[PDB]
Design a protein around this nucleic acid. Structure first.
Length: 207
RNA sequence: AUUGAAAGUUCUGUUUCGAAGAAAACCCGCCUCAGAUUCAUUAU
């Protein structure tokens, strides 16, 4: 199981609108993170035999977190965090280290066209699996238990990869975000969980 | 190539017209630079 870390510098922020008034999300879903990675190999093509040129990277695990302060504003929901930093962790085993590292440098935007994001540095390595009590900052699933004080937790709804095809709605999956609503920031939460990969001290929780 | 893809809330407008900081008023009334000093002794 290989892991990779990437540091992104945002220009003005990201904007993803909720499916089904056009409110937006607080943090990008894993689908956008996988699509950004897939952009490095499928550049120039928009329809493959027809739902998306991204129904092939569906089994790559990804998480992301903030490192600065921002504000969520509806004026079409947007998340303004200019000059901020984003840390993205990719965990997978489908491809070797070289291919993941090459695709990691080829990220251009997160969400829509205006949400450009440069790349500052990357790291590649081998991860280890643990199950003891850990502290994490990345968001995880709803079914994961919590031992600490419930004070900085929010509930969101994301979709599986089934939504990659047009004319079809993805399955609804609940997610828990360790985020402060105003101002926008990230906080640490202690979880027990069953599977956690150590990617450099900042344990990533998946189930 | 990501609930992503496709879009300007943009077009037309004077804070403008007028009204003296003006009139009267002394820096003027007394004071001294004052007393002492050889250019002469020698040259057809």
């Amino acid at each position: 199981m290989i892991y990779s870390k990437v540091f992104l510098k945002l220009h003005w922020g990201f904007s993803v609108v909720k499916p089904l008034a056009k409110p937006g999300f607080y943090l990008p879903p894993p689908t956008t993170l996988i699509g950004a990675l897939s952009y490095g190999k499928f550049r120039g093509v928009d329809n493959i035999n027809y739902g998306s040129p991204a129904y092939n990277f569906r089994n790559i695990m990804a998480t992301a977190r903030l490192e600065s302060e921002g504000v969520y504003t509806e004026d079409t929901g947007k998340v303004y965090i200019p000059n901020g930093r984003l840390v993205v962790v990719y965990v997978t085993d489908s491809i070797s280290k070289e291919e993941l590292e090459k695709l990691c440098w080829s990220i251009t935007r997160i969400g829509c066209k205006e949400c450009l994001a440069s790349v500052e540095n990357v790291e590649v390595g081998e991860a280890k699996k643990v199950s003891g009590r850990v502290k994490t900052r990345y968001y995880f699933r709803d079914t994961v238990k919590v031992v600490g004080r419930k004070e900085f937790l929010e509930y969101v709804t994301f979709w599986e990869e089934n939504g990659y095809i047009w004319g079809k709605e993805g399955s609804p999956v609940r997610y828990i975000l360790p985020i402060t609503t105003y101002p926008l920031a990230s906080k640490e939460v202690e979880v027990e969980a069953k599977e956690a990969y150590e990617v450099g001290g900042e344990y990533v929780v998946f189930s």
